[PDB]
Design a protein around this ligand. Structure first.
Ligand SMILES: CCCCCCCC(=O)OC[C@H](COP(=O)(O)O[C@@H]1[C@H](O)[C@H](O)[C@@H](OP(=O)(O)O)[C@H](OP(=O)(O)O)[C@H]1O)OC(=O)CCCCCCC
Ligand SMILES: CCCCCCCCCCCCCCCC
Ligand SMILES: CCCCCCCCCCCC
Ligand SMILES: CCCCCCCC
Ligand SMILES: CCCCCCCC
Ligand SMILES: CCCCCCCC
Ligand SMILES: CCCCC
Ligand SMILES: CCCCC
Ligand SMILES: [K+]
Ligand SMILES: [K+]
Lengths: 252, 268
């Protein structure tokens, strides 16, 4: 009977309202600075070259904006990079199909590839989960000879994982923009702003396991939310119980 | 037995790996078969438009013109109208577009059109995602269960009107046909019709719908209503992709048992 979705709905809406105000607070500042300096770089280009004119420069921008729809891409390996992005639902967004048959294929290629790749990621998950189980069975015998012990183990998970899958692969995949790269990619958000050939056979496997790593990390963070959702549910429960108490005694 | 079923798993994992590898190799060759032609045709005609602009204006900096195009394309990484017409513009981080952006992050859609440039907006986005993705996950799950029982109500009436003198196992297929039927109407067809006029051709809307809901990437009822279309459409493909995955387990068995017999016999 109890819906309980509406409350989670408003939390998400409110999370998004807070997120919005925080993003425009952080980004609309540089947006002005950058775009005041873009108006400068036209008027510096127009003044420094009387050869090109006002009416003719927009004809260049249009044909650049037309070239945005296109840009060797689609080579033997770049289309397989593209194909990986589709089934992983990463989809960096840099290259997309333009032919009507490439879209109809991409629709079928996704509807079949996403579940298929899901089974691969699931197997790599269980594969990697027992490998981690091997590493903690030894560690949970050396200094254990137990309810709070389970926290020390989860500290070493986030520690050893954010080394292999966040810190280290900065080389494989500045200091911040690497962690930013890693998180946006492995959360499958789609890392658009940035993106030897024998490189991608090993890199795409660090992706395959890093995807399994954040898949677990995201699920733990979700499990911490079920916990904190109950603590906040019971806390409000008490403070309503005593305020009702209080309102009753004060009236007498 | 405890590390013997793991031997049985790794075999199944490595085979799924190769299936994925082939699936990507096949997909690659099919995309480059379809898209390499469009590229070269447009790529040759974009070199023409350079060498027509260079001859038409000898007194522009021939060598430094690409240095202009780069700095324009570098500015394209931000939302820009760098034109002498309307040197004044709008913000892509306004009150509602950042709330568009935020949703794309928690849904992991993240169209990639606008990304944060401030290192404080990146550090926030990392934390905002690591917390928002699980949070939104519970909403999508609740919307799923919410929508699933609504479907259960609609199929309990339909699986009693057609009860003639019946087989329980075969009726379950008629129900999954009417699911994909209503679903691709409300969540694929009707929006593709609406997203055809407002914004596109007939195909490019369904392409838009699929790419979005697979999470790849004055009475104005748009973002409170469209993104609630998204919220439920995401729950819809989440089920659809899961059935397609369930269809694959079935087909994975049947092909694995069929190869089993044809290995065993080899035509007597
Ligand atoms: C980023 C941090 C966000 C923290 C979010 C934390 C706030 C938040 O998320 O709300 C949760 C709560 C209602 O949600 P609620 O806890 O009842 O959700 C239930 C809960 O998850 C239980 O596990 C299950 O039921 P039960 O209980 O075992 O029977 C069931 O889950 P499942 O069956 O589907 O598996 C759900 O019915 O609402 C308030 O806290 C009241 C004050 C509003 C506070 C809002 C403003 C603080
Ligand atoms: C014992 C409590 C520790 C909990 C771990 C909190 C990690 C928060 C991650 C925030 C990411 C900041 C990235 C900054 C990189 C320059
Ligand atoms: C895109 C579909 C490719 C089909 C690949 C089938 C592989 C069959 C392997 C059978 C092993 C049991
Ligand atoms: C243009 C129609 C696409 C239908 C794809 C169906 C794949 C199961
Ligand atoms: C460098 C400033 C980032 C701090 C983000 C604060 C979000 C609550
Ligand atoms: C296109 C159908 C996929 C077949 C894969 C079978 C799994 C072994
Ligand atoms: C942004 C989460 C604080 C409680 C709603
Ligand atoms: C990072 C604060 C979110 C509320 C738990
Ligand atoms: K995604
Ligand atoms: K994505």
């Amino acid at each position: 009977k109890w819906k309980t979705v509406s409350t989670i709905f408003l939390v998400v809406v409110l999370y998004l309202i807070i997120g919005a105000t925080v993003f425009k607070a952080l980004e609309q500042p540089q947006e002005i600075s950058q775009r005041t300096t873009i108006v400068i770089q036209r008027e510096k280009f127009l003044r420094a070259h009387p050869c090109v004119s006002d009416q003719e420069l927009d004809e260049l921008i249009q044909q650049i904006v037309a070239a945005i729809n296109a840009g060797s891409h689609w080579d033997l390996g770049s289309s397989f990079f593209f194909a990986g992005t589709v089934i992983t639902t990463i989809g960096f967004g840099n290259i997309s199909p333009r032919t009507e048959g490439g879209k109809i294929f991409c629709i079928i290629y996704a509807l079949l590839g996403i579940p298929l790749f899901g089974f691969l990621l699931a197997g790599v998950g269980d594969q990697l989960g027992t490998i981690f189980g091997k590493g903690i069975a030894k560690v949970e015998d050396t200094f254990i000879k137990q309810t709070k012990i389970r926290i020390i183990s989860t500290i070493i998970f986030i520690l050893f994982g954010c080394v292999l899958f966040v810190a280290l692969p900065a080389v494989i995949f500045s200091a911040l923009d690497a962690i930013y790269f890693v998180v946006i990619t492995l959360t499958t958000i789609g890392f658009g702003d940035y993106v030897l050939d024998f490189y991608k056979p090993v890199v795409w496997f660090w992706i395959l396991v890093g995807l399994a790593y954040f898949a677990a990390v995201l699920s733990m963070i979700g499990d911490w939310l079920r916990v904190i959702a109950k603590k906040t549910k019971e806390a409000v429960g008490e403070f309503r119980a005593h305020a009702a108490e209080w309102t009753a005694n004060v009236t007498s």
